[PDB]
Amino acid sequence: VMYYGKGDVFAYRTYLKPLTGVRTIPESPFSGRDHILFGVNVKISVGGTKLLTSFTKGDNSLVVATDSMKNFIQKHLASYTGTTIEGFLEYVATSFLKKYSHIEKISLIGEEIPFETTFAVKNGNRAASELVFKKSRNEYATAYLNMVRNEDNTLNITEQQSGLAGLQLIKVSGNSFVGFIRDEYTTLPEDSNRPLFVYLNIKWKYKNTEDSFGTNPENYVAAEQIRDIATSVFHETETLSIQHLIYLIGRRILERFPQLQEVYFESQNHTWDKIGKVYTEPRPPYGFQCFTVTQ
Amino acid sequence: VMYYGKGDVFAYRTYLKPLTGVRTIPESPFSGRDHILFGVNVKISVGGTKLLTSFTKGDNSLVVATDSMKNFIQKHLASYTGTTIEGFLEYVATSFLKKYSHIEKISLIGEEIPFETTFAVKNGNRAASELVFKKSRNEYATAYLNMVRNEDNTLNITEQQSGLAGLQLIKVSGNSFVGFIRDEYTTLPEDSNRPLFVYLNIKWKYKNTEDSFGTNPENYVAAEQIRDIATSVFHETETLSIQHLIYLIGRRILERFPQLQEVYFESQNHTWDKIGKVYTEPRPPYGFQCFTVTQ
């Protein structure tokens, strides 16, 4: 392994070009983003054989300072004319490889810093403020991109992946976990009606990477919509396990978004212990599942 | 100082009696709580001269186990027939002092564990789910109560305080900070248009402690409403400082809720550094303000 970079590059841009014309779906009201406030936390990693001597000899001749990568990212957010994190990452990746010809590969993560609307009384009635927003520490969209320079000097995206992270859902009834292996190590009672509490990270890949950029918004898959699919399917389903639930969420996502190639899940179980029904937090050990549905 | 207790007593109650009939205000749509899911994190502290020898002699004869206080709280959430955290704390405080006659004083904190509604498609249309909720790591209501046993053996609430914690608001324009002292220690530039980013903890006290309990919902002050007042006033105000803003929020709260005696603010400044306008996270040091408005 040989690479280096800069993490936690927070950047806040006001009045980015709004995202409009997004194809809606029955599970979600989402149609676009106003982009009055556009926050993203970026991580950049770059590699290339010519970086070797910066490690082996302490030769900094070919080192773009990691501090300079932060400048690069933040300046490019100022000049980005697109409408999505995915497109911003492509802009950064392309501009960076174009600028630094000794770099063979660049990997980017972009994590949304989400802000929610708030109420203000405008003259006489409540409405959404166009100035005051609430910082949310809940779920947030993500994006990932890897781009390489080929031997013929062309630039190629080798990997792209969008996601929703930090979604925490509890369904008070309509969940079971029964029929699992009962042997010498099994002390968990069967439960025909548990308040299943799951953390979800959902990530998707497009059949055609262009669709991720939002240029044709009709083909863009929004994390807001993925969220509302997850909650909708959770509501509709008499779950039989987390495994069972996330497969059904995945199938619905692929059905709603045929331009997607796959959906990947990282789930955790945080179901409370039962002790009017009252519950309490469990001990720290948490179950998890990881699973890919493909189109 | 001599007291002891139990903290992080999480308790989750389903289908608590709903809170209804709350007097509304122009800044907020709030009218009640469905209480399908009622989460609270409780801290209990108890004191009394008769506890001395548990410290000085290792005599546990008069020690209610802190583990038993957790049981006490969680069982009482199961039997609570009221509608607010404030009333739940009074129920716990009264029942505890009634049960343990060697305890002279009890202090309680109750912190809401908030859950937000989610979308589910019911047959054909999107609607709020009655089963699936989203755990929120954003702002949350709080409550505080101190109750003592008097020499004549009556029980008296000596202190009560409700609050909203963890509110994080950023207003992209319409804020200034100018005219402050410029001397040998001053390097901050004046700013006539900054994206003021403030954290708020807002706490209020009632003229009549009965109003906090929600028995007559007409007199109850909801944290949801305090929130929407704060965002509304933030929107309306060309702020001149955080100090200036929180005074104006306080005045509005007292005007809307004449049954309140005071409002107390704990604010922090997290305004981003400026570097299309792009900003970034500042260094760690944060300003703060603390201030009480009284009716």
Added chain:
Amino acid sequence: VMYYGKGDVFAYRTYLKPLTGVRTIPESPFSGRDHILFGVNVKISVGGTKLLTSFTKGDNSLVVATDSMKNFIQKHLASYTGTTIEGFLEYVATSFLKKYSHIEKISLIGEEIPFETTFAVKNGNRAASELVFKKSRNEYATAYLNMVRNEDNTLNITEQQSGLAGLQLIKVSGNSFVGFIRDEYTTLPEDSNRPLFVYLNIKWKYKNTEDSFGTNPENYVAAEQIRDIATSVFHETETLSIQHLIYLIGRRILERFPQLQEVYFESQNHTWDKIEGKVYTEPRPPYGFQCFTVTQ
């Protein structure tokens, strides 16, 4: 209430004057501090009735910017010629009130950012490095000070307290918790041999605030020595509860340090649940706690 200030003012100073000349105790080998690296996190709060219109009218004429307070703290750490956080707080407080005559009161917290020594081989032997240090996220020393300006423009310290925070101690055996109330709310079993795990925050107050500054270091009480007393007493004691333990720790402290007026304890219970060798695991979140003062 009315005050404002600045928090999380981290400041790292190199080559502060060493602390030496301290008085030893049986429980502790502590003999001083090198101060190659002296890290402190500072929080400052100021008050004064002349600040009212900064709230009520948005008038910043008498506002020291909280950004300026950060500059003030860090610049005074560069010029500080003493040897303790406690003395540093007094330096900042007195300088600040002298500088800003409309401020009537100032409160300061300083929390050590501790660093530990590391090994290095040089000139044929291994020894502690004078250059490379390890940042510790374990326990740390604390200091608190409040100072007011009187009507006649004199300044007075009105409260001072030192401390040790974040001490996390587990004793594997030699602890019991029995004989507590067993009623309808009791499911905890009696346990004659538990592996008591306590978090400890220990704070002390001096009879004479001057002893806190280090200027006559033989009268200073070091957080390192307080830690060592805590661990020794825990080892020595067949504990009957955390309450029992902390009273005993506080008595030894006031016995070892007759210049102290009182010691205050904030303890939390984080004892593991028991599940061949003995194995334990982390408990559910709810934690017991105790708060208790021992006085001379």
Added chain:
Amino acid sequence: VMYYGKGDVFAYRTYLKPLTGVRTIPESPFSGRDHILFGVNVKISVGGTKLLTSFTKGDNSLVVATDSMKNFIQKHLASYTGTTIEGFLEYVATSFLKKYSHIEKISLIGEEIPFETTFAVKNGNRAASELVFKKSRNEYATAYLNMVRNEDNTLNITEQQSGLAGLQLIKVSGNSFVGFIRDEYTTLPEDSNRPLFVYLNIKWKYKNTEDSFGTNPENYVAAEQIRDIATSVFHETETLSIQHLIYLIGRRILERFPQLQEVYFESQNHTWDKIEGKVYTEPRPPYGFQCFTVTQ
């Protein structure tokens, strides 16, 4: 992908067999582990094509409950008779695949929960306590193992890696960063004497996985020794960058431990900003990082 498992399986064992008989190096006084208290946080992942219908049809017939995996881990810590996290992981992995024949692969992480010794006075002298320990939130040792079941029901380790995580080192002087690219994106000034502060995660892989278990302890590589090498090399070196430093640390490691095949580094830059004595303060959040492997 398809797998499921259990994380944050904390487990604390008393009086595990001591680790002794290890081979020393100049950089480190490490000579073994007492194991009065042996804490580990374990994460387990399992896979197998026979798990598909648990996802696609909600059929739990072949689901080992993740709750049961936690029980499995903790019970095997009680019966484990070895001396390392690495050997413990192999014990759990082999037992689990033997128990559950439909599982084809298992991956395990174990992270040390470290505890430090404390002082206590007894029988007329002060010495380290055999009962009271201090929980450390600083660096800790790690271990990773993956094991698969072959078609013929044999089991094989397919990957093994040990490590040290959370090492936080600041060197106050004797570090430079100069000569990097200065273009339109460069605002960082050249600095010939900076107080380099690095976070280090160091992982190593053995030529022979058996050497990782402790069974012949003279061939074991201890995280404690790796730490000491890291700090020594940092002290010794006039660093020209973090990149420069970590390559040098990795070469010394592979020189000291010829039984290692490779060492891998994850470093982060957390160097303070400079603001009488020298004073520094915490930087803005963005942090540089490096990832690099040195091989024999």
